[model samples]
Target: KNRPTFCNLLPETGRCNALIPAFYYNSHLHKCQKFNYGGCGGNANNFKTIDECQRTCAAKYGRSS
Candidate 1:
């Protein structure tokens, strides 16, 4: 069980979302979690609330320090 994160942009919502636990840190996961129009993964920008990020990412990426 790997603990990598994957983030992507919503095709319609334009909102950033993340996939829960990447499969071998696969590109598909990153592709799903894309940000903006093209950017993805770590390049993705998060919301202003740290709590929101923690809650969302924790499921896939684990809790932050």
Candidate 2:
């Protein structure tokens, strides 16, 4: 019973894809994944604005990273 935990990104609406998909990426794994941290940027929670979100993404999930 040991595994990395990830947030769910399924919509509860009548149909799936009801809303924006959530991102839940794990920096430790070096993957640009996505999970619903309640932000459009996915698992990125350190961002409060869109600009900050992009910065975090480029720094964490950038191609150079």
The best candidate in terms of lDDT: 1
lDDT of 2 by residue, 1-63 (tens): 843333122222222232344433344754344323432332313333433434444353444
Query: Candidate 2: which stretches are off by over 4 Å?
Result: 1-19, 36-54, 60-65
The regions of model 1 sitting more than 4 angstroms off are: 1-4, 7-44, 59-65
Q: How many Å off is the CA of 22 in candidate 2?
A: 1.6
Residue 8 error for model 2, in Å? 17
Q: After superposition, how far is residue 55 of candidate 2 from its true place, in Å?
A: 3.7
Over all chains combined, what TM-score does candidate 1 have?
Answer: 0.24
lDDT of 1 by residue, 1-65 (tens): 96445433322223444543321112344322322332244333343344444445543445567
- TM of each candidate vs. truth: 0.24, 0.25
Q: What is the model-wide C-alpha lDDT for candidate 1?
A: 0.36
C-alpha lDDT score of every prediction, in listed order: 0.36, 0.36
